[PDB]
Structures are given as structure tokens and as C-alpha cells.
Design a protein around this ligand. Structure first.
Ligand SMILES: CCCCCCCCCCC
Ligand SMILES: CC(C)C[C@H](N)C(=O)O
Ligand code: NA
Ligand code: NA
Length: 502
């Protein structure tokens, strides 16, 4: 089996896995919509009672399976629990990362395209009216991704966006095709430092933004000022947990696959903790100190929250660059922004394609080249659905990146810490560890976390089951149909692998 060259490379690789678009795009929106500071508390709690334990658990499962030449959940679940149904459940460990990759890589390509156009200086040129200043950039984004006037099902992506998507795929491939240490690790050792530097620079530059309408410091205060009136709102907790799952790459089967390339004797406790901590730092300190503080700086708190509620891509692709365009050298600043977004996105995407690649290598005994090329082909082909169908991206992100990750987290936790055995699981987690996990977390992994995830899934189900059947748009049905098809396909591949074993 292939392994990580150095411990530093491993750390930066996992960090590259976690630190992504979710830190600089999703987090600011989630925090703004949930009352800033009021969102932090639950967040932190969700990080302590869900993020960390699941992180360690996925590291342990990953290394455990990897020691036996298996990097994906279809086989690992079976190793932990002898049953076909365990493999069937394991299919999600490929389905989720594949589906998520499908649109994630596309958004990444967006950030790349914007990076290029902003570098070359091909951007809209605003003239004191906000709606105005924002309009040109809105039209810019809409022209880029081909957004219809009213609410129409067909998207008309520009040729440039398509070509840039091809390029993005090419970059992902060029990295993944080299392998774990030659490809992912090498790239991480550069992209990560670059990312942190750009992030810090942007943070400082944004902090210097001050106008008659507000300052960045106001944004920082709003984000770090506690509010206990929202603690009774279940939605805030749900959003916190969801953000934790998303930002830590939990339930995506990515952490596991990355961990399968960690030598059996190497520690996964301190390494995992370090990766998670790095992610949280990049999220609450870097991600939260850019978009929101700027929006508040220019338009104020209220308007910033409104914009945040307007959409996820509205803040990162429209509002922020529109704000930068009003400052000296704002175009270049925008470039730095989108470049940062690009490196983060890429460092995540390779991580979410590695599960499929790894399955092709370990179970179907395909070479790395073939595995990478076929995975790339599948993702690229499937991407057209996201590119040309409106509301498709949202549907995939919902079924895979929202419900699926939680369901899968609960599933893996139950299989590893209950069926496989709590004591054996614990011993497996701590074994070889440079530091030992606090005893309390034991009781946290066995009782608290699973209970939380269960309750969450129950509420979600209760709320969505009636809405699902009654949905007008046909694009969502096409998407559902297709991703179901993907699930059947992966199940079939698992079947073929199983038959090959015999
Ligand atoms: C292997 C060392 C990599 C160093 C990366 C430096 C990048 C500097 C970026 C400045 C914005
Ligand atoms: C799906 C994951 C790779 C997402 C990543 N953890 C992020 O924060 O963007
Ligand atoms: Na993250
Ligand atoms: Na990343």
C-alpha cells in the first residue's frame, strides 16, 4: 500500500482536505444568518461533541482498513462487521464524495475563472448607490454561470466557464495522478502555506476597511458577541452541526481514505487533532474575518446579514468583489480572494475524488492512472447535469452534502463503536498515539454523539418527508433519478469487486 512520506505532509494534506470553500464561503453565511455570536456557542459545542470524536473515529477506521489494503467504507465496514448490508451501507462512502465532487469541482472552477478574469482585469466597472455597485457584479456572475432572467430550469454557461471547468479537471487529475506522496502531499506542502499567507493578508487588508457606514471591527464584534436568545432555536444548532460536518469533511469518506495511507504504527490522535484545529483556525479566525467584516464595513450589520441571507454565492462572488472595486487596487485584491478560494477548493476536491480512485485501486485492482482517469471522466460527465440544470446543484448538495453526511456519520460511528465493539474501537483509536484521547470522549463517542445525530436525523426527516413528494420543478426529479443511478452503479461495482475476491 502507498503511504504518506512525512508526518508534516500528512498533516498539511488532511488540513487541505478540511480547509476549503466551506471556510470562506459557507461559514460566513451560516454565522451571519444565525446571529453571528449566537451561532458560535453551538458551533463550538458541535465541534467538541461531534467534530473531534468523528474525526478521530474516521482516522482510526481509515488506518485500520488501510493496514489490510482497503481505503474505502465498502470493504472497511465489512472488516468491522461481517455482512453484505455493511457493504451496501459502505456504498455511501463513495456515493457521497462522488456526488459532492460533481458540483464542488464546478464551484472551484468558478473561483478559478474569476481568479483569471480578475487578474487580467476583465471585470465590471462600477461608478454611491449600493444596488447599483452590486448590479454589474451580479450580471457578471449570472453571465458567467448562465443564470436565467426569471426562474427557468435551463442554465446557459459561457464557453469560458466550460473551458475553465475542463482546465480545473485537468489540474485535479494532474495532482491526483502522481499519487499520495508525490501528488497530494507535495501539492499540500505548497498550497497550504500559500493559502494561509493569502488568508492572513486578506484578513489584515479587510480589517483596515472603514467607512461612514461601518467598519470591519464592527463585523468582528457582531461575529464574536454572544447571544443567548438564539440558544432555544433548534435551527441554530442544526446549522452548527451541519457546518461542522461540512467543514471537517466528516461523513464524506474522505478522511477515512486519506487515513488508509497512514502506516499502521503511526499516530492518528495528535495528527487528527492538529488537522481539525488548523481547520477551525482557518474557519473562525480567517474565514470569519474577511467576508462579513467587509460587508458590515461597507453596508453595515443589518445589510450584511440581509446579503448573507440572500444566498451563499452572493456574498463571495458578488458582494465582496463589488466592495473591493471601491478600493484602490480592488481588482487585484479580488484576484487574491478568488485565488485563495481556488487553492482551498482544489485541496478539498482532490480529497473528495480520492475515495473513488482508491476504491478502483484496492477493490478492482486498477492502476492509479486508470483509476484517476476514469474517476475524472465520471465526475466530468456527471457535471453537465450541474452545469445546465438549475436547482440541480442544490439538490445534490442537499441529498449528499447535508443529509447523507450526517446519516453516514451516524452509520460509521454505530458500526465502529457499537457493533465492532467500544473497547476495541477505543484501543484502536489510541494505539500508536503520540497523545492519548481524554477518557471522557469514550463516553462521548458511545452515547452522546450517536444520540445527537439520531435526534437530528429524526427532526430532519420529520420536516422534509412531506416536502419531498410535493415539489414542482422537474430538474430536481432528473437530478434525484441520476444520483440514484449513480448509487446503483457504485453498488454494482462493489458487487463486481466482491465477485472478483471469490
Ligand atoms: C515547500 C515550501 C512552500 C512555500 C510556499 C510559499 C508561497 C508564498 C505565497 C505568497 C502569497
Ligand atoms: C466536502 C469537503 C471536502 C468540504 C471541505 N471540508 C470544506 O470545508 O470545504
Ligand atoms: Na473546512
Ligand atoms: Na481544501
Amino acid at each position: 500500500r502507498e503511504h504518506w512520506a512525512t508526518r508534516l505532509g500528512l498533516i498539511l494534506a488532511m488540513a487541505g482536505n478540511a480547509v476549503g470553500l466551506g471556510n470562506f464561503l459557507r461559514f460566513p453565511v451560516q454565522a451571519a444568518e444565525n446571529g453571528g455570536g449566537a451561532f458560535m456557542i453551538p458551533y463550538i459545542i458541535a465541534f467538541l461533541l461531534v467534530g473531534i470524536p468523528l474525526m478521530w473515529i474516521e482516522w482510526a477506521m481509515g488506518r485500520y482498513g488501510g493496514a489490510q489494503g482497503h481505503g474505502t467504507t465498502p470493504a472497511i465496514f465489512y472488516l468491522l462487521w461481517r455482512n453484505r448490508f455493511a457493504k451496501i451501507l459502505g456504498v455511501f462512502g463513495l456515493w457521497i464524495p462522488l456526488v459532492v465532487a460533481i458540483y464542488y469541482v464546478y464551484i472551484e472552477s468558478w473561483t478559478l475563472g474569476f481568479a483569471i478574469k480578475f487578474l487580467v482585469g476583465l471585470v465590471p466597472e462600477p461608478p454611491t448607490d449600493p444596488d447599483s455597485i452590486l448590479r454589474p457584479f451580479k450580471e457578471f456572475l449570472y453571465s458567467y454561470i448562465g443564470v436565467p432572467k426569471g426562474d427557468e430550469p435551463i442554465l446557459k454557461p459561457s464557453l469560458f466557464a466550460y473551458i475553465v471547468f475542463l482546465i480545473t479537471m485537468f489540474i485535479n487529475v494532474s495532482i491526483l495522478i502522481r499519487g499520495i506522496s508525490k501528488g497530494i502531499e507535495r501539492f499540500a506542502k505548497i498550497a497550504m502555506p500559500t493559502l494561509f499567507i493569502l488568508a492572513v493578508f486578506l484578513v489584515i487588508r479587510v480589517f483596515l476597511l472603514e467607512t461612514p457606514n461601518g467598519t470591519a471591527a464592527d463585523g468582528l464584534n457582531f461575529l464574536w458577541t454572544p447571544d443567548f436568545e438564539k440558544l432555544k432555536d433548534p435551527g441554530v444548532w442544526i446549522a452548527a452541526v451541519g457546518q461542522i460536518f461540512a467543514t471537517l469533511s466528516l461523513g464524506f469518506g474522505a478522511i477515512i481514505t486519506y487515513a488508509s495511507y497512514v502506516r499502521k504504527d503511526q499516530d492518528i490522535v495528535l495528527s487528527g487533532l492538529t488537522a481539525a484545529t488548523l481547520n477551525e483556525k482557518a474557519e473562525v479566525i480567517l474565514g470569519g474575518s474577511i467576508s462579513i467584516p467587509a460587508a458590515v464595513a461597507f453596508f453595515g450589520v443589518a445589510n450584511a446579514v440581509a446579503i448573507a441571507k440572500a444566498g451563499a454565492f452572493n456574498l463571495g462572488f458578488i458582494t465582496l468583489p463589488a466592495i473591493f472595486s471601491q478600493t484602490a487596487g480592488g481588482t487585484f485584491l479580488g484576484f487574491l480572494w478568488f485565488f485563495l478560494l481556488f487553492f482551498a477548493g482544489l485541496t478539498s476536491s482532490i480529497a473528495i475524488m480520492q475515495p473513488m480512485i482508491a476504491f478502483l485501486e484496492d477493490e478492482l485492482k486498477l492502476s492509479r492512472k486508470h483509476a484517476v482517469l476514469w474517476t475524472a471522466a465520471i465526475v466530468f460527465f456527471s457535471a453537465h447535469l450541474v452545469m445546465f440544470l438549475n436547482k440541480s446543484l442544490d439538490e445534490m448538495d442537499f441529498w449528499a452534502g447535508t443529509i447523507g453526511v450526517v446519516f453516514f456519520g451516524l452509520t460509521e460511528l454505530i458500526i465502529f463503536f457499537w457493533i465492532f465493539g467500544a473497547d476495541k474501537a477505543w484501543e484502536e483509536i489510541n494505539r500508536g498515539g503520540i497523545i492519548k484521547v481524554p477518557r471522557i470522549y469514550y463516553y462521548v463517542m458511545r452515547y452522546i454523539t450517536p444520540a445527537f445525530l439520531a435526534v437530528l436525523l429524526v427532526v430532519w426527516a420529520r420536516e422534509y418527508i412531506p416536502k419531498i413528494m410535493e415539489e414542482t420543478h422537474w430538474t430536481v426529479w432528473i437530478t434525484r433519478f441520476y444520483i440514484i443511478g449513480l448509487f446503483l452503479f457504485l453498488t454494482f461495482l462493489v458487487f463486481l469487486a466482491e465477485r472478483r475476491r471469490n
